[PDB]
Structures are given as C-alpha cells and as structure tokens.
C-alpha cells in the first residue's frame, strides 16, 4: 500500500538519538545562555529553526552528524554594532561551555555534539521601543521556543499565547495576524561580509507547517524524499539545487490537497516540468521569493546552467516516478522506486 512509503520515511529520517540530543543540546544551550551573566542582559530567544524544526531533514550518510540550525536572538541595536562585534560577545560564553568544541564559521558558530552538529547565528530584532518589546514576546513564547519539530506538532501556530495540545483553549489559537510579524524578520550576518543581513525563520515555519496541512501531512515527507533521491543519484545530478533551495522549489511545485505520497511526488514533478519547461528552454532558472522575507530571491545562488541540469535529472527521474505509480505488478513497482530511492525503500 502506502506503507512503503512510510518505511522508507522512517528509514530516511534523523534517527532517535540525533533527535534526543538536538533537543537537549538546544535546551542546555538555551539555559546556558539565558543564566551566562556577561549575557544575562542580551540574549532574548534560543530556538530551533531550519529543516530539523521544519522536519524537512533527511538523516546524513556515513553516520555524520546532521545539521542542526540554532538562533540565538538578542536585543542589540544592529546599527550601532556590526555583526561580528556582536558574535566576538559570544566568544568567551563558548570557551566556558564548549571548549575545544566550537569553531568560527564565518556567519555562523559550529558546535560539535555528540550525534548533531549544531549550528548557531547571532540575530538582532530591527524594531525598538514598544514596538521591539511585542516581537520579543513572540521570541519568548512557547510557539518559537518549542524543540518539538512539524511532524509531531502538525497543530503549531504562530503565536505568543499558542500552546501546543496535551493529546487530551490556548491550543486553539490561530496564527497571529501577519500584521505584527509578517515584516519584522530577523537580522543575521551576510555569509560573507560584515553587514547585517535579513531572515524571517518563523515565517518560513508557518508556511511550511500550513502547506504541510494542506497537504494531509505528506509535504514534508516528500521534501525529504525528494532529499533522499538527489542524495543518491548525485553522480547524475549537480551539486545544486540543494537544501533549503531545493526544500523551497518543492513547496512550490506541490500542489495543495495532496492524498498520497505515490500521487504527491509524480504531482509535484511533473508540475516542476510544465511550469519551468519556459525557463529551462531559454537555459534560465526561476525568481522565486522567500516565505520569510518576500523581497529574496531563495534560487539567487543558483547558476542557471545548474537549475538546468536539475531540470534534465527531474525528467530521468519522472520516467521511472511515472512508471512506478502507473505500474500495477507489485515486483516491478517496488523495484521500480527503488531505482528512484535506492536500497532503502522496501518491497511490500
Ligand atoms: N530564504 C532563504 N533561506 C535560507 C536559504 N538558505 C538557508 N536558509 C535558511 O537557513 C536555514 C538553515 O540553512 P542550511 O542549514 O544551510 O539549510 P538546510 O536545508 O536547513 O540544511 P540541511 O537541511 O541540514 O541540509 C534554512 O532552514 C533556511 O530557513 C536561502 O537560500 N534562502
Ligand atoms: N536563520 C538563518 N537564515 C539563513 C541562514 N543561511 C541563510 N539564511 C537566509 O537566507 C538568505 C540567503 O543566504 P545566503 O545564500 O548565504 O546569502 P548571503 O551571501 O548571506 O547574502 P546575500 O547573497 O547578499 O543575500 C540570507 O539572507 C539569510 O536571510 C541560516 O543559517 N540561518
Ligand atoms: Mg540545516
Ligand atoms: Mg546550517
Ligand atoms: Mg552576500
């Protein structure tokens, strides 16, 4: 049935131990910095964010660490120190507690865990005064500072009130209206100069958890299946899109209303041909914007040769995809997926 399917999802996921330790880890770092007295008075928000929070990871070969994004929200005033000057705060905090453990990675700090790589950027708040104060209680909420990750909490909201259910009413309360946090995103450092630049995580989770309803859970599972298949057939593939533009170019070719994985993925390949066969025609790539900060294009990196070559390993993959939810022989369709998926899906 669609059971293959969810093997091959448990299989593809971050493991139990990576998922235990990214959630103590994120809450040892988290109390760490709020009880650390040189930053008793800056650090406003520890949480979780990228595709381990969104559940858009796919678990790493070789058993190397995944990677886990952190952010760390302060209440500094971006324009009056740059952000390096505001990651040097945060130096002597981790020579304390994770020594000979972190390392400087341009925008952001690494810390090595047991099972998980953490990864951490220092952000800012743009707004200030009364108007800073209310976005703080957002950061501070229990809405961003849940370690639970979309596929257990599909009810998340956007939400300073929102708590998440008991599996027995704050639970009951919606989004908050966009107006108070649709544009006031985040400030992190540019990879690679000295200037602060824009992000909007929350925003990307609120649109990933509403498109995951929308699709009856099953959007999520096909961004790391989808993960899974570019990570097996990289020889054939170029080494971007990957990740989040990757993770983003999917959400956009799923459409809502998806009832199963089988007729979720052919979907949103196919969909992925017809919308882009103008622009890969023209050797061109999409201008998609962000969820979080609308004014980002998230394929500006992208070579458009190299969307190109994505597109041709889209239709090698579409072949086989097709086949395999049009196949009826259960030997030919397991194994059909399995060309598509390596080893990892199973047989009925
Ligand atoms: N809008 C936008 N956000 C990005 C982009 N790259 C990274 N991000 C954000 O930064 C987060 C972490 O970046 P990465 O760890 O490099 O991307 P990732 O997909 O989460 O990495 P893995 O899932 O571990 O493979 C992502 O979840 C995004 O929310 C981008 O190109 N555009
Ligand atoms: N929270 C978070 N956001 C990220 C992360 N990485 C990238 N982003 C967001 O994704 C956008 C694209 O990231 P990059 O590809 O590194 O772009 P950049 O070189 O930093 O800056 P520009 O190219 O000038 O926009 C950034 O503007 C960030 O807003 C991350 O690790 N964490
Ligand atoms: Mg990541
Ligand atoms: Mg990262
Ligand atoms: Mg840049």
């Given at each position: 049935?669609?059971?293959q399917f969810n093997?091959?999802?448990?299989?593809?996921?971050?493991?139990?131990?990576?998922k235990?330790?990214?959630?103590?880890?994120?809450?040892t770092?988290?109390?760490?910095?709020?009880?650390?007295?040189?930053?008793?008075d800056?650090?406003?928000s520890?949480?979780?964010?990228?595709?381990?929070?969104?559940?858009?990871a796919?678990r790493?070969?070789?058993?190397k660490?995944?990677d886990?994004?952190?952010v760390?929200?302060?209440?500094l005033?971006?324009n009056?120190?740059?952000?390096?000057?505001?990651?040097?705060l945060?130096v002597?905090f981790?020579?304390?507690?994770?020594?000979?453990?972190?390392?400087?990675?341009?925008?952001?700090?690494?810390?090595t865990?047991?099972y998980?790589?953490?990864?951490?950027?220092?952000?800012?708040?743009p707004?200030?005064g009364?108007?800073k104060?209310?976005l703080?209680?957002?950061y501070?909420?229990?809405?961003?500072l849940?370690v639970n990750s979309?596929?257990?909490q599909?009810?998340?909201r956007?939400?300073?009130?929102?708590?998440?259910?008991?599996?027995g009413?704050?639970?009951?309360?919606?989004?908050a209206?966009?107006?108070?946090?649709?544009?006031?995103?985040?400030?992190?450092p540019?990879?690679?100069?000295?200037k602060?630049?824009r992000?909007?995580?929350?925003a990307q989770?609120?649109w990933?958890?509403?498109?995951?309803?929308?699709?009856?859970g099953?959007?999520?599972?096909?961004?790391?299946?989808?993960?899974?298949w570019?990570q097996q057939?990289?020889?054939?593939?170029?080494?971007?899109?990957?990740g989040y533009?990757?993770?983003?170019?999917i959400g956009?070719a799923?459409?809502?209303?998806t009832?199963?994985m089988?007729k979720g993925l052919?979907?949103?390949?196919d969909?992925?041909?017809?919308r882009?066969?103008?622009?890969?025609?023209?050797?061109?790539?999409?201008?998609?914007?962000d969820?979080?900060?609308?004014?980002?294009d998230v394929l500006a990196?992208?070579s458009?040769?190299?969307?190109?070559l994505?597109?041709?390993?889209?239709?090698?993959?579409?072949?086989?995809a097709?086949?395999?939810?049009?196949?009826?022989?259960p030997?030919e369709?397991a194994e059909?997926?399995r060309?598509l998926?390596?080893?990892?899906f199973?047989?009925?």
């Open positions: 049935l669609n059971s093997a091959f999802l448990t299989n593809i996921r971050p493991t139990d131990p990576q235990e330790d990214w959630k103590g880890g994120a809450k770092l988290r109390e760490r910095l709020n009880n650390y007295e040189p930053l008793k800056i650090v406003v520890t949480f979780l964010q990228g595709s381990i929070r969104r559940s858009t796919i790493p070969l070789n058993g660490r995944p886990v994004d952190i760390v929200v302060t209440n005033d971006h009056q120190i740059a952000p390096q000057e505001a990651m040097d945060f002597p981790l020579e304390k507690y994770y020594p000979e453990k972190w390392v400087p990675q341009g925008r952001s700090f690494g810390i865990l047991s998980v790589e953490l990864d951490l950027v220092i952000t800012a708040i707004a200030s009364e108007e104060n209310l703080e209680q957002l501070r909420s229990e809405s961003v849940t979309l596929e257990e599909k009810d998340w956007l939400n300073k009130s929102w708590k998440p259910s008991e599996s009413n704050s639970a009951n309360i919606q989004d209206p966009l107006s108070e946090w649709k544009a006031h995103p985040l400030v992190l540019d990879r690679d100069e000295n602060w630049g992000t909007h995580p929350l989770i609120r990933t958890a509403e498109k995951n309803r929308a699709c009856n099953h959007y999520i599972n096909l961004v790391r299946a989808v993960k899974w570019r057939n990289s020889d054939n593939l170029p080494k971007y899109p990957k533009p990757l993770e983003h170019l956009n799923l459409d809502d209303g009832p199963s089988g052919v979907q949103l390949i969909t992925f041909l017809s882009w066969a103008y622009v890969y025609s023209l050797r061109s790539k999409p201008s998609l914007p969820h979080g900060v609308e004014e980002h990196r992208l458009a040769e190299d969307f190109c994505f597109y041709e390993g889209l239709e090698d993959a579409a072949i086989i097709r086949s395999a939810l049009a196949s009826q022989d030997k369709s059909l997926w060309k998926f390596g080893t990892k199973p047989f009925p």
